[PDB]
Design a protein around this ligand. Sequence first.
Ligand code: UMP
Length: 147
Amino acid sequence: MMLPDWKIRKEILIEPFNEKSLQPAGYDLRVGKEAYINGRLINVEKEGKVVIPPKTHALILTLERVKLPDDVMGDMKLRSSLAREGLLGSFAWVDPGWDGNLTLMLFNASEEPVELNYGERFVQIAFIRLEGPAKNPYSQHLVLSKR
Ligand SMILES: O=c1ccn([C@H]2C[C@H](O)[C@@H](COP(=O)(O)O)O2)c(=O)[nH]1
């Protein structure tokens, strides 16, 4: 089952916690301090925004650290207005036991740049309870490694 807002507030460490981000069954993660586009690190905190060029992907760090219990899985989707403007998120599962800020990939499929402001709500994470705790459950900066 999915956790409602009042259980998210109790069980998931989400810091810094933004009241306006809590949704009926999820939390709107915000654009954080760092992004990475076309080989270049962007200080989003300093610049106040990140601009995703047309037909280009970007890595964006969430403002929030999220810590999941060993019996909850995190499930992210882009916010609806950003999808309408041509963004697609490429998201992995957030494993039970995860603790950290998330590095999120967004692709701008449109022919026009798309801007996101520092601190803007951009991805809603929902939380799904596991039937029992994982036998083997699973961080403040962008992850920039590749295989
Ligand atoms: O889009 C996503 C999805 C997940 N994670 C975090 C939480 C996951 O548990 C973890 C998986 O990392 P690996 O164990 O695959 O390297 O990464 C991200 O940073 N971005």
